[PDB]
Amino acid sequence: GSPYTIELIQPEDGEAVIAMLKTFFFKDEPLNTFLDLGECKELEKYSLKPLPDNCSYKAVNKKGEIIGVFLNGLMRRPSPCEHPKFKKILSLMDHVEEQFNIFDVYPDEELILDGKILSVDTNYRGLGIAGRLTERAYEYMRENGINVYHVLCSSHYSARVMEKLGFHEVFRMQFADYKPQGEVVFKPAAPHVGIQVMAKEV
Ligand SMILES: CC(C)(COP(=O)(O)OP(=O)(O)OC[C@H]1O[C@@H](n2cnc3c(N)ncnc32)[C@H](O)[C@@H]1OP(=O)(O)O)[C@@H](O)C(=O)NCCC(=O)NCCS
Ligand SMILES: [NH3+]CCc1ccccc1
Numbered sequence: 001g002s003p004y005t006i007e008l009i010q011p012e013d014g015e016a017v018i019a020m021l022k023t024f025f026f027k028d029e030p031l032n033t034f035l036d037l038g039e040c041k042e043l044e045k046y047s048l049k050p051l052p053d054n055c056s057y058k059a060v061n062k063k064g065e066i067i068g069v070f071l072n073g074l075m076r077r078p079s080p081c082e083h084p085k086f087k088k089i090l091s092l093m094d095h096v097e098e099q100f101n102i103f104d105v106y107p108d109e110e111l112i113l114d115g116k117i118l119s120v121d122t123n124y125r126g127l128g129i130a131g132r133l134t135e136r137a138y139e140y141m142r143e144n145g146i147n148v149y150h151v152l153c154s155s156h157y158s159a160r161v162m163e164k165l166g167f168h169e170v171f172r173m174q175f176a177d178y179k180p181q182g183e184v185v186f187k188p189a190a191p192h193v194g195i196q197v198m199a200k201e202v
Helices: 011-023 030-035 041-048 084-099 129-144 156-164
Strands: 004-008 057-061 066-076 111-120 148-153 168-174 194-201
Touching (some): 011 041, 011 111, 030 084, 041 111, 057 129, 129 148, 129 156, 148 156, 156 194
Antiparallel strands (some): 004 057
């Protein structure tokens, strides 16, 4: 009996979204937790960047507070940062993109939807809000003729959200195996075993 709405995130929402992410995602996404991310303007800018694509969604409670967000942006088929902790995360994301091209799985797709930042207020977890946020994007995909939803998960819990919705894990990289320059960079808490790249054909 905790009602909420699912709404498109507007440009004026940037501040509220960042406030929520700082309380939750910035502290409790597993890589951020492992590194103890702290203040990070670069992740703020990173989070705001896809908003103008108009396919990022917020869950809002009966008090008008944001209790969940899924920030998404369009991702195109490829063709030929001072914050020292976020730099490591960014390098990991570059690395995955170097080792796995989602577009090889979908050779006839030019544009796909990329699920970038997913966060739900701890008090409201286990109610399927992340799933509701994810499904909302299907409406956008259908309107725009987008066929694939790609979500790189750094959490076993977000991977579970995607699995319930019928996403399949098309690439796994275990953190224990990520050793750029020969040494382990990340050792997040179990059950977060690795990067789980999830894809749905909607
Ligand atoms: C990942 C996250 C967005 C899921 O949101 P959610 O709305 O709770 O999603 P769900 O209700 O489907 O729960 C997913 C799974 O989380 C697990 N979970 C972790 N903590 C939980 C808790 N406090 N309450 C209930 N379930 C929890 C459960 O295994 C659950 O599976 P199940 O309910 O089907 O048995 C949320 O856990 C979160 O914000 N985590 C921290 C930030 C993060 O890791 N983001 C994703 C990085 S890719
Ligand atoms: N998709 C999750 C990856 C991630 C982890 C931490 C900061 C930004 C992005």
